[PDB]
Write a protein that binds this ligand. Structure first.
Ligand code: LUC
Ligand code: LUC
Lengths: 304, 304
């Protein structure tokens, strides 16, 4: 029993973190096989960030200008290329610590662990969700660019995020490992605003199932609702519309607790309309939406 | 910017997790040098847990009855001894992955990362605090016994916790790596209750400093207070009495924000007396007490 915002063990990812320096700028790179991936804004000076032409900027750069350092050893760069917003630095040595890996583009609402790094050194690990507005509410400072987001399936690490920038709102934006930004963000120091961030309804419900499994049942009521009636309430509170696919994904949790999804929706409806009344759920005074139904099942069953 | 319940990177600890089996029971062990540490209740059957005499139970056990497995390889046990509530199984092979390590007994209010494990395999990592009542609000299931709590100082891992049991209240209890339980708990399946759990005032204040550093300043008021006046309020709300040592430890955070500790105490006083009024602080609707002043400084500065 107990329910925590749990991250994946970070060891397989620590063994991939490297430091990439280009002139004055130092950020993190991800070393898998003989390639180091990092944000392409490593080649920019503070003046270049206002309106960078990365193709022109990369032309004034050669393999020897990219300093890659893994621990205390220098990696020799034999190739460089830009793929969307990431630079791929081909090095002469394959990472002996490269785990089984995949590059995946995650969906909004899905979760992942972040290994925050500075100077190619991991400082901490936390669990995040890709927000419906394609931002992440992370914890990153200057130097954290190149820090990655990932998931682990037994021995396979799926890299899903690379940190590039913080918006003036304090939320974070970045790319998949192919350099494509999540959301409308561009790697340029210009006013960029994150759209309306909605609450991931299927995740809140999964967390309400986690609460029931862990003894917190005060919010369970004698009511039920329908998908349409619940969604009228969800829209009012800027919650993602619940679909039959979401009801389906909640299925295993509904089967374990014996509480129909629409019955849980009715509890959520009353919690939205009436608030918590000073009460808590899993030690939280607000509705948590950063646990997918998969995270709940795996934490509440014990998947290693 | 951004503030998350961040855990230490777990790689150095994953390289130490092993599986210890004794008859029917399987739990986790910690392999450092040629010694595997695990909870001594691994030798108990379900009938033994009601009133175990570990000295007598250990006498019916020989080195060959303790199955230690690191990954897919079996470790040969050449010695066994009980040190308080932990068994130390001397193996013939030193862990080639043993990091620089220390065994420390942490103080209540201090934080640490937990690497939850099952069958010697890490499943997740989260940040915890040793509660003033010496319990931890963790996330552990059956098989998680032997999972450890730790801190990292650059390259040195300080092991501070080994998970042993869950209380009927859903909170967790365990020992330091010398087998001494934190709190009055005994490793016996008998009704054990955790005393009153108070809020770690110095940690809430440190988190209020983290909030100010990250833009959340709504709670800052035009008032001040004294240590004695604040502590009258803290006692009412089951908060730890704030001492001059706590004021001292808050010093670097007070210097960064330019907000005197007693001014922050006055904001906390009003938040305790009036609540949040539907507002949030660092995305939380309640006062968070699981970040020490050290955690705040290190997260808000970027210590790797
Ligand atoms: C300092 C820090 C803290 C946490 N995480 C990241 C950083 N770094 C940056 O954000 C630097 C940067 C890189 C790019 Cl590619 C674009 C930038 O401008 C965006 C546009 C907008 O809004 N801000 C800024
Ligand atoms: C099942 C599980 C889930 C999470 N973490 C741990 C466990 N395991 C246990 O708790 C087994 C156990 C070991 C001991 Cl040494 C004493 C025990 O009785 C205490 C006394 C009281 O209260 N409960 C029970």
């Amino acid at each position: 029993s107990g329910f925590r915002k749990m991250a994946f063990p970070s060891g397989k990812v620590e063994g991939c973190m490297v430091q990439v320096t280009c002139g004055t700028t130092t950020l993190n790179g991800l070393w898998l096989d003989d390639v180091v991936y990092c944000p392409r804004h490593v080649i920019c000076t503070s003046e270049d960030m206002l309106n960078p032409n990365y193709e022109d900027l990369l032309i004034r750069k050669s393999n020897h200008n990219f300093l890659v350092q893994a621990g205390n050893v220098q990696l020799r760069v034999i190739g460089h290329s830009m793929q969307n917003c990431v630079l791929k630095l081909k090095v002469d040595t394959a990472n002996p610590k490269t785990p089984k890996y995949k590059f995946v583009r995650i969906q909004p609402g899905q979760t992942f662990s972040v290994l925050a790094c500075y100077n190619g050194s991991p400082s901490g690990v936390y669990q995040c969700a890709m927000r419906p507005n394609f931002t992440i509410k992370g914890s990153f400072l200057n130097g954290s660019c190149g820090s990655v987001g990932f998931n682990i399936d037994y021995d396979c690490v799926s890299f899903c995020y690379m940190h590039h920038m913080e918006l003036p709102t304090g939320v974070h934006a970045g790319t998949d490992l192919e350099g494509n930004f999540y959301g409308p963000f561009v790697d340029r120091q210009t006013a960029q605003a994150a759209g309306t961030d909605t609450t991931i309804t299927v995740n809140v419900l999964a967390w309400l199932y986690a609460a029931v499994i862990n003894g917190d049942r005060w919010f369970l009521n004698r009511f039920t609702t329908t998908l349409n009636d619940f969604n009228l309430v969800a829209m009012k509170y800027n919650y993602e519309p619940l679909t039959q696919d979401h009801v389906d994904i909640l299925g295993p949790l509904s089967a374990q607790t014996g509480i129909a999804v629409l019955d849980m929706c009715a509890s959520l409806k009353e919690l939205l309309q009436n608030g918590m009344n000073g009460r808590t759920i899993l030690g939280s005074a607000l509705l948590e939406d950063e646990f997918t139904p998969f995270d709940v099942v795996r934490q509440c069953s014990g998947v290693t």
